[PDB]
């Protein structure tokens, strides 16, 4: 019955999104969420919902929601879905098998690219073992790809575990930056639900 708008404005319209390997997470609570404005925006390239169908989100009440945001390459978007495998779904950001939420993505080629090449976006490439769902790894220790221990210094068979996307305004549509926001619902006194 409380009447205050959810801060959906700042999440989607933030000036800076973090790298895929250090994705942000935000709690939204004690507010009424109007999901109609998002859907009829036509500014989103992809709006896919698992376990819950849109156009009914204005009903239903949730315990608490989650907003995960980052930026990745345009082609790699299809890896953000349950049961998918790849570099992103193994070493960077993995979704559980029982996901109940929606995935929103839209092209951002005119904000995240620079003339000289943007090297401020990175992604993890090597890891000893795959990730568990919703687990984040931030460390930057040197990966040991061979029999000879590296002892914390890089060299032959001692690779740095992070690599740069290198976005540019002239890249193909498959290699352009895309912004992604993942909403997770959990279905306790419900606090967030629309009018």
């Amino acid at each position: 019955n409380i009447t205050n708008l959810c801060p959906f404005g700042e999440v989607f319209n933030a000036t800076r999104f973090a790298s895929v390997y250090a994705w942000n997470r935000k709690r939204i609570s004690n507010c009424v969420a109007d999901y109609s404005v998002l859907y009829n925006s036509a500014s989103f390239s992809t709006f896919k919902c698992y376990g819950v169908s849109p156009t009914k989100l204005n009903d239903l009440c949730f315990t608490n929601v989650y907003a995960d945001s980052f930026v990745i390459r345009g082609d790699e978007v299809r890896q953000i879905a349950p049961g998918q495998t790849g570099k992103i779904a193994d070493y960077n950001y993995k979704l559980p098998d029982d996901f109940t939420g929606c995935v929103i993505a839209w092209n951002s080629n005119n904000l995240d690219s620079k003339v000289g090449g943007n090297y401020n976006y990175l992604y993890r490439l090597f890891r000893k073992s795959n990730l568990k769902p919703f687990e984040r790894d931030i460390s930057t220790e040197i990966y040991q790809a061979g029999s000879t221990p590296c002892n914390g210094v890089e060299g032959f068979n001692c690779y740095f575990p992070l690599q740069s996307y290198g976005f540019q305004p002239t890249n193909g549509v498959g290699y352009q930056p895309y912004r992604v926001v993942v909403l997770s619902f959990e279905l306790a006194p419900a606090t967030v639900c629309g009018p």
Partner: single-chain antibody, 230 residues
Framework: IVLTQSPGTLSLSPGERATLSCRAS???????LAWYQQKPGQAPRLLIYGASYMATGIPDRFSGSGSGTDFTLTISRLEPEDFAVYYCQQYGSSLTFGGGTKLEIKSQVQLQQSGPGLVKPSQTLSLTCSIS??????????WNWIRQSPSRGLEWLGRTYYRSKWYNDYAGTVKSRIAINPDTSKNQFSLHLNSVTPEDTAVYFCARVISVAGYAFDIWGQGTMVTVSS
């Protein structure tokens, strides 16, 4: 690991496509293949690192693909200025270049080289590579030395860098008689060879490598030729 350039030589016309091929002796788990284009009389230029990602100020005609033991480069629409040579470089447990294909048709950081160009046989050779626009003791860079001769192609000599202290590496062929010395006071690095032989006649370049950019030779030097003769 040995890289073999599959197409020998191609002759095309303006407008259509071109297709290259690079083959690895065994699997490259590091996946750090890079493609370089060299015009005559000029230092090589970087095109693609990571086998797919574009470099700085490069049009969209060039495309890269491949994985495992094979790789390919594709040119969408040729231009009369594409009279050049194209190489194929890898990194991992070893650093090796490729033979390369000759194709014929019908900026904020600078490296400057200095040193003598002629030396008496059985003497010492000294070269220096001054840096403008960066600090030689950077945390995320390495400084290399490359040399080229027509009989052997492009050859890797040695490298130096600094993470907590100074670290050096050298190629097995030249281990016994090579030295690399940095100097932070005047921000340079120099190469020394105590003994020289007639076959050493070659053209030398100094190059910078950034670890987050696929270990690709980003910025090259002017390069100078050295001839060993009486």
């Amino acid at each position: 690991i040995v890289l073999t350039q599959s197409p020998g030589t191609l002759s095309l016309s303006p407008g259509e496509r071109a297709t290259l091929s690079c083959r690895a002796s065994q699997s490259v788990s590091s996946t750090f293949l890079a493609w370089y284009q060299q015009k005559p009389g000029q230092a090589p230029r970087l095109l693609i690192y990571g086998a797919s990602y574009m470099a700085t100020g490069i049009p969209d005609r060039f495309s890269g693909s491949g994985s495992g033991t094979d790789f390919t480069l594709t040119i969408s629409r040729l231009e009369p200025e594409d009279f050049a040579v194209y190489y194929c470089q890898q990194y991992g447990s070893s650093l090796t270049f490729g033979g390369g294909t000759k194709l014929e048709i019908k900026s904020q950081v600078q490296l400057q080289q200095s040193g003598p160009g002629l030396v008496k046989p059985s003497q010492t050779l000294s070269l220096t590579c001054s840096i403008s626009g960066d600090s030689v003791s950077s945390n995320s860079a390495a400084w290399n030395w490359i040399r080229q001769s027509p009989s052997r192609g492009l050859e890797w000599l040695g490298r130096t860098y600094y993470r907590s202290k100074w670290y050096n590496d050298y190629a097995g062929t030249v281990k016994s008689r090579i030295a690399i010395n940095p100097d932070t006071s005047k921000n340079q690095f120099s190469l020394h060879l105590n003994s020289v032989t007639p076959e050493d006649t070659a053209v030398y370049f100094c190059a910078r490598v950034i670890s987050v950019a696929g270990y690709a030779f980003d910025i090259w030097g002017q390069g100078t030729m050295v001839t060993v003769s009486s």
